[PDB]
Write a protein that binds this ligand. Structure first.
Ligand SMILES: [Mg+2]
Ligand SMILES: [Mg+2]
Ligand SMILES: [Mg+2]
Ligand SMILES: [Mg+2]
Ligand SMILES: [Mg+2]
Ligand SMILES: [Mg+2]
Ligand SMILES: [Mg+2]
Ligand SMILES: [Mg+2]
Ligand SMILES: [Mg+2]
Ligand SMILES: [Mg+2]
Ligand SMILES: [Mg+2]
Ligand SMILES: [Mg+2]
Ligand SMILES: [Mg+2]
Lengths: 190, 134, 352, 199, 113, 107
RNA sequence: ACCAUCUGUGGGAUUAUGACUGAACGCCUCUAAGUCAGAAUCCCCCCUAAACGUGACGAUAAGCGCCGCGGAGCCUCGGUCGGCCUCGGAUAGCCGGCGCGCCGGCGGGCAGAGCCGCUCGCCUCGGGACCGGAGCGCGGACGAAAGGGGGCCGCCUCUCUCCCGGAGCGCACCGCACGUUCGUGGGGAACCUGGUGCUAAAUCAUUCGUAGACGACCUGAUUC
RNA sequence: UGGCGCUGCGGGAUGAACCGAACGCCGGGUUAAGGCGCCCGAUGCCGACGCUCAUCAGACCCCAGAAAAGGUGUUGGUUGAUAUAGACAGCGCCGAAUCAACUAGCCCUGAAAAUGGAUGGCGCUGGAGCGUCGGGCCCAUACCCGGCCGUCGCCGGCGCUGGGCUAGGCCGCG
RNA sequence: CCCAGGGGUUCAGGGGAGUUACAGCCCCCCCCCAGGCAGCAUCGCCGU
């Protein structure tokens, strides 16, 4: 079974100006610009309408494995839309029982030095991705703030910090110490 | 990105097969592979035909669904498919390719002599503009 | 059929074949990685193993049972007279490896350096580089040489330097010096060629190549032991005394299948005179040769800040089987490969 | 006289099956840019296929066993050799007519390279299937000359583009000359348009 | 070389002419098996061929060959009639002067003569 | 040039048998069976050079020798043809040039 | 002689696994497309060897090397029978022209289904051209991944070249094969010619013992 | 009962027995079984329809490694059950189908042995994989036609002579 | 040439604005099997 046509329309706000160069989607908003290539999906992209622009993702003669990549295109561009308008604010939370986790941000939010994790003398230096800025959260004790335009870069920078604070040779169900992701939000809250 | 689609009334060019070189109108789509084409004004009666031997053209006639040959012929003549195709560069490159294959030895000699002097006149004009520009 | 008691093998398969080294002078097979940030410098130097002795120093490693204690450490004396630069070679990186593009020799080349270009120097007319040296004076040769210097700066990515030892300053019988390419790891190619051009027919001391408290590598050929049995070549177990037809062999040289003796099986052959490269040889002292300071030749390269005895590095009766060390020398911790008076190619460490 | 083929975009066995047939017919083939040759299947498949090839060695003496060449040119050369009777004088003569090169060396940089449509990835493989490059496969098995080849191919495309831009101006000059001398070649362009030479 | 076919002789051989004034090919016989006939025809219905041009006329007389005065007279008798009608076809004077050869890419199985 | 380029692709064979009295030629422009009909009956020639001089018809002796043949039928569907020569082609000619003459003509 | 002493090393893709984004399947999901971390394994560096693999460079003996398409000849070995002197690449898009746009072309005619070269000579029309073309010619730019041309702008000599129409001569060898090229080809030993260039090494014996079963290897071997 | 042994030949990479076919010496033609990416003769068809991605893929008689049991991989089918008096999933909102069981293809898990190695090899993934088929093509010492040799059979022929009839010879036919 | 003259019915891969209207499709009747041209020519088979 191959579906003749499988489409999906994406709404684009007026503050975002989008340009299509083949399959390379480029969005530009108040928070910057983004650019993600989709030449590995092998679909059709089209911008309809001058005002109130939309993004039409078409798939002709695709099986179930190929129809699944249609919404993945749309959900990625929508992340690129809210990344240049609202941004992404991933919040970390350092959980500890006895030894407090000392986090010092260096290189203007491009490096996180994790100290005093489980009382270990080794220092954990986690470098953030390009365009991702880390900052010790205010109005909270052991909370971090990761900001950026690309969700795949901010959420990956959060996984680097979280997997860095991993307990070895212990009952992880008992030693629940580490810096975990507590909230996945946006920089601008509307 | 696509401009030519397979639809009811799409005039297609048969690249190979028993009716290679003729135009047909896609009157119905049987399955993903085959269609029901019919060229009333070209000499291809109504029959099933695969899409691999078709080449979509920029001509779409307004024929109803599963209408008989009397009405498929009207839209073919209403849209002047044969007139627009004969003046299109697609057919003119086909006509030029057919004439080049029918060239005799005397025709090639006339082309050899014509192209020999035509290139030498253009080649000198290119040298003339290069000397002028400098 | 498995061996009941496990045991490691009797050698390293990474030093095969155990043949005589095809060359006598050690070969630097890998120079340090070129870094354009650091200043211009050489990364190799030829030396001659004079002999061994021991020193007394106070170790200063915190946390050791030997901290702040006197130790007697064996050291090796390597007499390294200054080398004369007589050539520049430019290398272009090709998909088939580095390739020698240009080779510019100096205008004047000593007779001890030309001895390397001959097998019978005594009965041969000293004709080497006689027609080439004229290029440095002819206006046609100068222009051709300037095109060769520009070809190195434009096309070459690895600039090496040909240098030779001064065997007149050694107590050795050999007068034929040893030539060697010493890679320059300083900076841009334009600066490496200019630096090497101004160093032509000019001596280079070991004090400029290496420094005090530096881990360097020692390359060269080991001591030839001749044909040796498997008991001495691979250090295998000696068969019991009652073993018929010999007891200093390997009992089983392989199973039935494969029906072939394996290359990993230890066999009898030639031991010693192998090319080796031992790393992390700390320089303990860079001594100065005999030099007249104020009319009197000073011999004080074996005095320390706590000894003050006016004595030279040469012991009583000189280094046995070598001679007298009258030039600049290096002092490496421990032993180095080769016999006495063995030419050693000192190299900077490839590691940080 | 020499069939110069560009290896970029071609499949390993699809191209080797054709090059091996041309050299047997007494034709000299030169395959350039062997690092650009594609192989069907994901990269981890073809990498394991070569790592399993590295294990095939004579247990008693590996210096006699299968020689595992790492260069993409010698990888494609061994693929063509497998489809030739290289143990006969006829097959050895066929190997002498084939010359493989990593990248496009100066002997063939200034040439027009052929393309085999029966071996291209776009024609023989689905757009959704996984493939692997021979340049990356070789780099991860011991090919030490990938970075130097990439930089030399990078400069080769700079001088090839400056020549193409000059070639575009010559075409612009030729098309402009046809309009400025159309009155003098009107009798000649009618002969070519009559016999289908032009249109 | 390209020649003009005149008449078939009783022994099947073809009476072939250049003419001589174009490509230096006199009136001589030619087998049809060793001849490629093109699609170009000139109207020589008005050309009068003498009756004495038989196979014995072109039979080799069997010590150096020399063209006799009868061969030259029969040549000018036929050439004087072919040249006026060849000139009516443009670019045919040089087409008969030219020689035929296969170049790169020209395949006889697809070439139309 | 008055002959077509052909390659001596090999003898008429199976897999474990070889009939050297029939050769398989590959014409440079014929890549289909429907195109081999034009060459049926054309003279084939294996021109080569040797050491000793041999008589030349209509000329002076030289080192050039030749083995004449003729295209007899088609072979397969890829434009191959079969040819029989007065002497079986030597195995050294495999992959070399065979001149396919334009005579006996049928056009 | 661990019975003394010294030294023993860097990366890359990734396995297991834990994850990111994210569908399929309004949710969820490490997976489907796409990403991340990732190891005594694997590959590589380091390290040992160095191929019927090789680069640069030195010196090259009455002999010998370059330079007179040496100038003519004798033996031998193979092909072969017009060139293409070049973008990068995309494949759910591409190419060309013009200052992110606009215009133009796409079953590729700015096209390899292509382009280019291609009258049997030798003299004559001047009808079309200003094709100013042709060099055993002299200079100058451009080449290093396995270095450039049968090419280029320049200066120079002579009397040119292509297309379309006329007038003239040629062994026209009498139907017949190996014709038509690359070719003034690649390799021999010997020739006779005129310009220029230089005049060395290896080996044996001997010696050294940093070396060796024997060869091999490291060395020294005349007037400073 | 056939076959091997007593038997070569084409095919199964290979091999006493399998498949095809049995054999004087040759030419032309046509096939069998089996094949037609290259080795290696033949699909260099603009073959047809689907199935299948395998970090141990798979690749065909004998025949030269797999099972029980599993998979929300994918594709079919079967039998039921909810739903525009508004279900399934997600927090009354949402607004179109959805869910369950079972079965069958391919792939996957189950699946560990010792020198380095075996769809025969190379390699193949818009197929050179599996299933269903079409057209064309490839060659056996088989079949057809033709030549030659020998054997065998002719209620064979000829004593009725340019040649002929050593009749134990000669000639003809199958 | 909706073949023309009387008309009936019918759905939808629903044209025009739900059943022909600004396309068509199908099933049926009574009028010279209306005539006219082709005849296995998109699909088979076989010759004295
Ligand atoms: Mg525990
Ligand atoms: Mg000395
Ligand atoms: Mg005993
Ligand atoms: Mg994973
Ligand atoms: Mg990673
Ligand atoms: Mg028996
Ligand atoms: Mg029997
Ligand atoms: Mg088998
Ligand atoms: Mg036969
Ligand atoms: Mg086979
Ligand atoms: Mg289970
Ligand atoms: Mg399995
Ligand atoms: Mg018979």
């Amino acid at each position: 079974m191959k579906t003749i046509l499988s489409n999906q329309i994406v709404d684009i706000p007026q503050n975002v100006d989008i340009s299509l160069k083949g399959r390379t989607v480029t969005v530009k908003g108040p928070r910057g610009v983004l650019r993600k290539n989709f030449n590995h999906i092998n679909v059709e992209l089209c911008l309809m309408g001058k005002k109130k622009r939309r993004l039409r993702v078409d798939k002709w003669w695709g099986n179930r494995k190929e129809l699944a990549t249609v919404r993945t295109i749309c959900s990625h561009v929508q992340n690129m839309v809210k990344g240049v308008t609202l941004g992404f604010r991933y919040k970390m939370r350092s959980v500890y029982a006895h030894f407090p986790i000392n986090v010092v941000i260096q290189e203007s939010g491009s490096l996180v030095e994790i100290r005093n994790f489980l009382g270990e003398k080794y220092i954990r230096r986690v470098r953030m991705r390009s365009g991702v800025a880390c900052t010790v959260s205010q109005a909270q004790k052991d909370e971090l703030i990761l900001e950026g335009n690309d969700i795949e870069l901010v959420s990956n920078s959060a996984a680097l910090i979280q997997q860095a604070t991993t307990v070895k040779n212990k009952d992880i169900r008992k030693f629940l110490d580490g810096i975990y992701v507590s909230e996945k939000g946006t920089v601008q809250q509307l | 990105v696509f401009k030519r689609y397979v639809q009811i009334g799409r005039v297609a060019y048969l690249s190979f097969g028993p009716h290679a070189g003729k135009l047909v109108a896609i009157v119905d789509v049987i399955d993903q592979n085959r269609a029901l084409v019919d060229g009333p004004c070209t000499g291809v009666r109504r029959q099933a035909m695969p899409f691999k031997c078709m080449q979509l053209t920029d001509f779409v006639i307004k024929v109803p669904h599963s209408a008989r040959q009397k009405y498929v012929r009207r839209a073919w003549e209403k849209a002047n498919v044969n007139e627009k195709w004969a003046e299109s560069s697609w057919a003119k490159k086909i006509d030029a390719r057919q004439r080049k294959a029918k060239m005799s030895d005397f025709d090639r000699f006339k082309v050899m002599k014509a192209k020999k002097m035509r290139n030498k006149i253009i080649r000198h004009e290119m040298k003339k503009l290069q000397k002028e520009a400098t | 059929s498995h061996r009941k008691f496990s045991a490691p093998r009797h050698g390293s398969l990474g030093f095969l074949p155990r043949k005589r080294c095809k060359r006598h002078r050690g070969k630097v097979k890998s120079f340090p990685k070129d870094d354009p940030s650091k200043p211009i410098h050489l990364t190799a130097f030829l030396g001659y193993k004079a002999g061994m002795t021991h020193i007394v120093r106070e170790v200063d490693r915190p946390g050791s049972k030997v901290n702040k204690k006197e130790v007697v450490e064996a050291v090796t004396v390597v007499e390294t007279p200054p080398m004369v630069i007589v050539g520049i070679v430019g290398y272009v990186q090709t998909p088939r490896g580095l390739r020698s593009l240009k080779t510019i020799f100096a205008e004047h080349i000593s007779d001890e350096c030309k001895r390397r270009f001959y097998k019978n120097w005594y009965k041969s007319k000293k004709k080497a580089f006689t027609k080439y040296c004229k290029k440095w004076q002819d206006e046609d040769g100068k222009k051709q040489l300037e095109k060769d210097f520009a070809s190195m700066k434009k096309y070459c990515q690895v600039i090496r330097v040909i240098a030779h030892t001064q065997m007149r300053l050694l107590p050795l019988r050999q007068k034929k010096s040893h030539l060697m390419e010493i890679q320059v790891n300083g900076g841009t190619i334009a600066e490496k060629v200019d630096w090497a051009r101004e160093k032509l027919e000019q001596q280079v001391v070991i004090g400029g190549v290496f420094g005090q408290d530096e881990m360097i590598d020692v390359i060269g050929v080991t001591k030839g032991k001749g044909y040796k049995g498997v008991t001495s070549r691979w250090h295998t177990k000696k068969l019991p005394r009652k073993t018929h037809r010999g007891l200093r062999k390997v009992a089983c040289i392989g199973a039935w299948h494969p029906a072939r003796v394996a290359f990993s099986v230890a066999r009898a052959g030639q031991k010693g005179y192998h090319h080796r490269t031992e790393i992390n040889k700390k320089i303990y002292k860079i001594g100065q040769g005999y030099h007249s300071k104020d009319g009197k030749l000073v011999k004080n390269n074996a005095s320390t800040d706590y000894d003050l005895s006016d004595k030279s590095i040469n012991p009583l009766g000189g280094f046995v089987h070598y001679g007298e060390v009258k030039n600049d020398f290096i002092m490496l911790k421990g032993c180095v490969i080769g016999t006495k008076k063995r030419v050693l190619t000192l190299r900077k460490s490839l590691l940080v | 006289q020499v069939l110069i083929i560009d290896g970029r975009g071609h499949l390993l066995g699809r191209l080797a099956a054709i090059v091996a047939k041309q050299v047997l017919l007494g034709r000299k083939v030169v395959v350039v840019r062997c690092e650009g040759i594609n192989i069907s299947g994901n990269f981890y498949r073809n990498k394991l296929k070569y790592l399993a090839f590295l294990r095939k060695r004579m247990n008693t003496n590996p210096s006699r066993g299968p020689y595992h060449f790492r260069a993409p040119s010698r990888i494609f050369w061994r693929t063509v050799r497998g489809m030739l009777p290289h143990k006969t004088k006829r097959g050895q003569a066929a190997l002498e007519r084939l010359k493989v090169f990593d990248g496009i060396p100066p002997p063939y940089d200034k040439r027009k390279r052929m393309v085999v449509p029966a071996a291209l990835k776009i024609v023989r493989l689905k757009p959704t299937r996984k493939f692997a490059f021979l340049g990356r496969l070789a780099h991860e098995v011991g090919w030490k000359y990938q970075a130097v080849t990439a930089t030399l191919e990078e400069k080769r495309k700079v001088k090839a583009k400056l020549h193409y831009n000059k070639k575009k101006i010559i075409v612009k000059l030729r098309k402009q000359a046809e309009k400025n001398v159309e009155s003098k070649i009107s009798k000649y362009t009618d002969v070519l348009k009559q016999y289908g030479i032009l249109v | 070389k390209r020649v003009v076919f005149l008449k078939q002789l009783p022994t099947g051989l073809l009476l072939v002419t250049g003419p001589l004034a174009i490509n230096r090919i006199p009136l001589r016989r030619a087998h049809q098996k060793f001849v490629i006939a093109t699609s170009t025809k000139v109207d020589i219905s008005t050309v009068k061929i003498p009756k004495h041009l038989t196979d014995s006329y072109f039979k080799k007389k069997k010590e150096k060959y020399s063209v006799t005065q009868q061969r030259k007279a029969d040549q000018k008798f036929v050439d004087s009639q072919l040249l006026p009608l060849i000139k009516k076809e443009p670019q045919l004077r040089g087409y008969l002067r030219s020689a035929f050869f296969l170049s790169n890419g020209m395949y006889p199985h697809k070439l139309v003569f | 040039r008055l002959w077509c380029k052909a390659t001596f692709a090999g003898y008429k064979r199976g897999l474990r048998n070889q009939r050297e009295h029939t050769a398989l030629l590959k014409i440079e422009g014929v890549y289909a069976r429907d195109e081999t009909e034009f060459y049926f009956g054309k003279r084939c020639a294996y021109v080569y050079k040797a050491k000793n001089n041999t008589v030349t018809p209509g000329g002076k002796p030289n080192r050039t020798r030749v083995i004449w043949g003729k295209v007899t039928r088609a072979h397969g569907n890829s434009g191959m043809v079969r040819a029989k020569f007065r002497s079986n082609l030597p195995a050294k000619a495999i992959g070399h040039r065979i001149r396919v003459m334009l005579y006996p003509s049928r056009i």
